Amino acid sequence: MIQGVIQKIAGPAVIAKGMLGARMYDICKVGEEGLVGEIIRLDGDTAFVQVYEDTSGLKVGEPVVSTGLPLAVELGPGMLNGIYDGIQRPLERIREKTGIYITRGVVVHALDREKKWAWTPMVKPGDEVRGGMVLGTVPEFGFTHKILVPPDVRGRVKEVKPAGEYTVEEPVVVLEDGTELKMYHTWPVRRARPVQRKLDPNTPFLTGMRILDVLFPVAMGGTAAIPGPFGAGKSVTQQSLAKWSNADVVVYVGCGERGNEMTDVLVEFPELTDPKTGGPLMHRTVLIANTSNMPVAAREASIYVGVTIAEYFRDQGFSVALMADSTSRWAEALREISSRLEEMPAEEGYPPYLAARLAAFYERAGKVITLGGEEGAVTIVGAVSPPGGDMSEPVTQSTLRIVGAFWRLDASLAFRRHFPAINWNGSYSLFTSALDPWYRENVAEDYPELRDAISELLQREAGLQEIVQLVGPDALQDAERLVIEVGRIIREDFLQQNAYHEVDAYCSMKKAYGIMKMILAFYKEAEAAIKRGVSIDEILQLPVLERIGRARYVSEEEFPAYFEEAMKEIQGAFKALA
Amino acid sequence: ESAGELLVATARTQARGEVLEEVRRRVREALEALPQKPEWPEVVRKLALEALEALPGAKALVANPEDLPHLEALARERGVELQAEPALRLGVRAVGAEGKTQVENSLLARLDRAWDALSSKVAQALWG
Amino acid sequence: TEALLARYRERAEAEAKAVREKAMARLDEAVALVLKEVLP
Amino acid sequence: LLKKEYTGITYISGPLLFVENAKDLAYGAIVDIKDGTGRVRGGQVIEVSEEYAVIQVFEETTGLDLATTSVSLVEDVARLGVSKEMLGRRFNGIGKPIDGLPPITPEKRLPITGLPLNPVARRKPEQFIQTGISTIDVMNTLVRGQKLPIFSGSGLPANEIAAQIARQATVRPDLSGEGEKEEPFAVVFAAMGITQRELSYFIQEFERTGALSRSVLFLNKADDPTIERILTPRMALTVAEYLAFEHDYHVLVILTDMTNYCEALREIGAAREEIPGRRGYPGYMYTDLATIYERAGVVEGKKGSVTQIPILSMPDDDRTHPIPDLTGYITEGQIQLSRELHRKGIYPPIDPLPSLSRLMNNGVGKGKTREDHKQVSDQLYSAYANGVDIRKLVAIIGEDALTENDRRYLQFADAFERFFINQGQQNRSIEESLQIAWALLSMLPQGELKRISKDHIGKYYGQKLEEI
Amino acid sequence: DLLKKEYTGITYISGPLLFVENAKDLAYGAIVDIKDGTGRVRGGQVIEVSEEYAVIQVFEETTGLDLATTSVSLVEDVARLGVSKEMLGRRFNGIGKPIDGLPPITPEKRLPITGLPLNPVARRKPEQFIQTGISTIDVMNTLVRGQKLPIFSGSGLPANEIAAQIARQATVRPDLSGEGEKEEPFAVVFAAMGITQRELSYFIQEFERTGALSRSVLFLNKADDPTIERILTPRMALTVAEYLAFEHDYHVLVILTDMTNYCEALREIGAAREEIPGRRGYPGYMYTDLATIYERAGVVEGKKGSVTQIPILSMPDDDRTHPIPDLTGYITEGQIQLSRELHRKGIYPPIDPLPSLSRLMNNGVGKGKTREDHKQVSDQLYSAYANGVDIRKLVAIIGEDALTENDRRYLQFADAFERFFINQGQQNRSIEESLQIAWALLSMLPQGELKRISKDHIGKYYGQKLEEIWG
């Protein structure tokens, strides 16, 4: 066990001396406190350690011990409904021990070693197991957590525990080689967990927001980026994605953000109900919380921990969603550490390998065939925070080369309280054509043409808005007047969404389809009536517009009747108008 | 269309792979039994000699204890020390003057270094 | 429609056997040549 | 304790100082540097290695030399001696009293950098603070435990608004249904980069109306050592945390100009040869600002609170400058001062269209304020919104192309800007702000008030603006 | 020879570099094998050697290495690759090893992957015209056989679909030049650098549809593979291509799927060494480095093969002045630049013809080739379209009603051009269809305004209507 002494301290970086024999990217214990660090450069007899804690008060000459292992996480039953910090330590245990502050150096296990899980086996003596197969299952909040073989183990079963209640560190299956498999195992967070085969995404990932689900869809194993300047409500959108998605498990990574957001989750989610099952919402969520005033070098650790936990739950056969709350903070941590190393930087002070780390992180997503043979997926939605709302910075330009969807938030929409404040002129998506076969069987037969008609309507109205900018709405004919009015109708009755209404917060696909159909039908009837001589005034004064305005505040089960009646009224409002 | 052609070409390629692998295994087994042959000592001497000729100024020689006595009569002539070791087989490995430089002249090593160069010859001589 | 696949499966297996036998012909010389060359 | 010195100085240049072996200096410690004349400076260990320790001198290095200077420890972490009887006092930026009265006697000594609050140990802010400014109390409510900056400009009057909020704020508990008037505020007022004229203004402002009895003042002039700017907010917040989470106080902290804080930070950072940032600001300004702003909030199982109101001047009225931009990513909303309202003669020139408070929905409504608060605020915002764009279109096309309700809306916009926003120096309770808002709404017909529910749209609609 | 020498005495590991001392017996540019305490072997290449120590750039990641146990041994003095005709159905990773499960190849030759420059005397002028079935390329920016023609793309624009369509539809038209009638298909060498899984699945499904896999070599360096390997992928692909072309007389088409990732790897390995930078940190020798890749194309005098390059690169902020597109434009012969505004209107393929260019276009058009009116039709189209765009810029200020009549005719021409000549959407147009559409569009203008076309070409092509070609 290599052990040396500290030689030089500067910020979060510590140079240890006497460490000949320490491996790159191993874990160390710095100081007599035992702070956790990782070796990122070897030189002569020394080693360069980045510390995941506060290095204040350290002294030269203190012990440094290398453990010989890379950063790893404990994967097993007991992670759901918990909250962790950047290196997977349960924050509730820290609170039970050391009060309302986060002092450094506490040691707790990630999975509770005193709980009892109702084990139910699935193998017999003499059977053959290889990496990724299923030994048995354990219930957890209504899920069925199934115990997997660690991805690099082979052998033949020698005995099994007989269906009792045990703790996680109870060896349940022993192989003929003598190796023991418990209810948990470890994995290095920088190595992607392997799969058998990558598949192509064919199923939408429903977020609950109309504009994202209709105009810029993302597929089940896809990747999205949502960069937005401050004051554009990025936090509300992320929380809504966490609250209404159709994923089985949500992993929320708060990499360098406000702490009140983590508190909002912790307080509200135990009250809300899971749509899929009957349970509370918190029972399907895992949080990793590394706020803005916690140690800087732990933000990257938190990113990697989150994506490894998501990969584990995917390997179990679920479909996971991973929300990385901000990747600009991870980029800033990278920049700081590279600054301590005296490296030459790339364009905006960032290290020259930032794009490689980003690409390797986003490339862990996708639909797969797991090693056990079942099918799971992982969807990544990463947030960015460009400095001046400037989409030409390094992080945004490196993220836009690997994501499949781009949801661009805008500040002009937010300064007039138009929420979710997504700019439909700068956004795009690359999954929309491969998803049409699903839309045609599961929403409506002609949903794609509805969506396309809405899009071209929006494009035309935004185009001629430039003309009306100068010469006033008085100077153009009734057709363009109707087009501007229909644009206003769309972007106040369809694109908007109140996130604090008990009805408008979540919106299904059938409902969005209904509203789109209503609007298009009205537009056609109005165009006919106009070209047979009526004016815009009587068109605007109609009351059915009030019916379409209140359409999004209608509950889901009582929407079909509302839709039928509104179609009848749309017909009658112009039939009686000759 | 071309799918059948791909099938037949895959079959041909993997058949050639099988036979070349077999030839390589054949010579791997032919090598690993030589220390029972009467040419063993002189080949080991010339191997150690070209090894020492590759390190001008070695300080030692590592070998196998079982063939250690084959190797005493030729290192005294130049002063390079001896040392035996069970793991090194079918060859000899020198050590440079600083301790930070080595040269190994094992049999299987030369085999793995030359097999790729000779694969073309084996193909041209085992088919046409 | 499938007769092409059948014909090609036949051709593949035939050529595989042909190559294997044409190889087992002179493998005994190939191995001796390689052992000659690898040796110092 | 006992004094141990180091005399192995081997290099002095600019602000740094290389002390030989001195291996007992912990990284980040505070030292003091005495020289051949006796004048004692202070310093901080920014790097320690086996050969030498690197020291940053708080003042300038004039007079130091390599033969007669010595360095001794002070402590391993900077601390501050606090006590409940700091209320009514006045300090200088590192705690020395400058009001003339004798120094305080400390009952604790807390490290000034503080510790991060465990996210599982917080709770959501829930109650509101009545500032007496209607355009904040009604439309951008300040919630107990929030961080709500004020975005000012060059010559806009942010000093006066700070002082007015400071001397008007109360907690107003009888609205809550408890009648527990049993705990008043404390107001910790931190001032940075301030001039003599503003200093006199603030002193007499606090002394005039008896607001000093419940305030602690940390005043820092523009001619003090730069290291004393980057410590003033930290001492202010340490005092505030002590008060709030040891004596159940409700504290309101006002940091008067973070634009000066950021210049001090840039100047100190460029002396350590670090990698620059967007406009020369250090690459870690976000983390440094975060360690200050994130010290506010409310904790579970305790009755205190810490509310922050940063104040800063956007340079060149640029909203994308790094200072206001980075402050935007950390806080929970913003209040913006407008220049056109200033030209019109309005005061305080708060612009209600680009302002927002994210935590407002929790602190208002039934049991906390009057019931109609939320919908009234929303309808007021929406009605002011379209008045402005009507004025924009009439500005270019003729006002001949007009309708019957656009007259209503222009009239509403003007009476709004002149009665709701322009409240002068008076202190308005929440009830009369709500009453003025209802009066201003009542001059728009129903059906135009499509945002408020139908019961209090009759309950409160009667009274019109005639009452002034 | 055959004996192995191992260098211990590693003294430094950080990022992608590794210093080793007492290694003067390594050649500059050699290939080494780095073996750790686990027995796992990874590769590297010497980039500076002196009497004291040598500097190595590691290809894999450096996790697990330590200064006590790892060793360094030589592989060869020059980096070479084993080539063969029998690699025409295979897939290799970014450093040339098989990844389809079949055994490795038996090399006929081993060639240095750095290559040698072609002799300017030994070269030949590229003249054979290639019909891609895309009108904006065939009529306005003709591609010839043996040319360098990149595609300047953006982030969300469909450059991959254009490349795959070109590969599917490209053919020579020997009946028009009267020479040869073999029309032997193209062999495709496809080098991917830092590709994602979505785009890789796209390209694979495409080639599998078309049946073009049985004559294609694939070098895949995915986005989760190590970064420093991208230095070797294009050199290996072009080694194989030049071998096939100038030994077995194939007609090869090389597709390099993203040069931006190549430049990222270059900048990383150049910043680790503190080179004098270029404009945004890109090393000062990036021009020479890219020129050694792009210039490995063309036709050789006295031989039948050819090599054609289609690099693809994404201008970062749609910025034509960024270092990567700037230098690449200074090397290659013209470019095909995509437009985001055209993409937003639903137009496919979104090729705007004004910032595009093909320098070799005049070598392979005209009489004895496609048709005698090709060149003049092309530049007349350019002039008319430029006029349409300027008139759009004027309408944006003085309103559409204030226009004259000929101005409205130019406005209409620009619009119909964009919506009928550019927007073809996956159909395969022969060159005659393209020229027919071009003349139907030109006939909108008055006959007296086609001032770049002669009188006889006007006389015998003017006057077709668009409704006739299709309704």
Swiss-Prot record, chain A:
Binding site for ATP: G228, P229, F230, G231, A232, G233, K234, S235
Superkingdom of this protein's organism: Bacteria
E.C. number: 7.1.2.2
Gene Ontology CC: one annotated term: proton-transporting ATP synthase complex
Pfam families from the UniProt entry: ATP-synt_ab, ATP-synt_ab_N, ATP-synt_ab_Xtn, ATP-synt_VA_C
Similarity comment: Belongs to the ATPase alpha/beta chains family.
Name the UniProt record assigns to this protein: V-type ATP synthase alpha chain
Organism: Thermus thermophilus (strain ATCC 27634 / DSM 579 / HB8)
Gene name as annotated: atpA
From Swiss-Prot, chain B:
Keyword check for Transmembrane helix: no
Organism: Thermus thermophilus (strain ATCC 27634 / DSM 579 / HB8)
Source domain of life: Bacteria
Entry's family note: Belongs to the V-ATPase E subunit family.
Disulfide bridge positions per record: none
Molecular functions per Gene Ontology: ATP binding; proton-transporting ATP synthase activity, rotational mechanism; proton-transporting ATPase activity, rotational mechanism
Biological role stated in the UniProt entry: Produces ATP from ADP in the presence of a proton gradient across the membrane.
Keywords: ATP synthesis, Hydrogen ion transport, Ion transport, Transport
GO BP terms in the entry: proton motive force-driven plasma membrane ATP synthesis
Coiled coil in keyword set: no
Protein name from the UniProt record: V-type ATP synthase subunit E
Gene Ontology CC annotations of this record: proton-transporting two-sector ATPase complex, catalytic domain
UniProtKB/Swiss-Prot annotation, chain E:
Pfam families reported for this sequence: ATP-synt_ab, ATP-synt_ab_N, ATP-synt_VA_C
Keyword Transport attached: yes
Key words, A-Z: ATP synthesis, Hydrogen ion transport, Ion transport, Transport
Cysteine pairs bridged by disulfides in the record: none
The keyword Ion transport appears for this protein: yes
GO terms under biological process: proton motive force-driven plasma membrane ATP synthesis
MF terms (GO), sorted A to Z: ATP binding; proton-transporting ATP synthase activity, rotational mechanism
PROSITE patterns per UniProt: ATPASE_ALPHA_BETA (PS00152)
Record-linked Gene3D superfamilies: 3.40.50.12240
Family listed: Belongs to the ATPase alpha/beta chains family.
Record's function text: Produces ATP from ADP in the presence of a proton gradient across the membrane. The V-type beta chain is a regulatory subunit.
NCBIfam families found in the cross-reference section: PRK04196.1
Descriptive protein name: V-type ATP synthase beta chain
Lineage, broadest ranks: Bacteria, Thermotogati, Deinococcota, Deinococci, Thermales
Chain's gene name: atpB
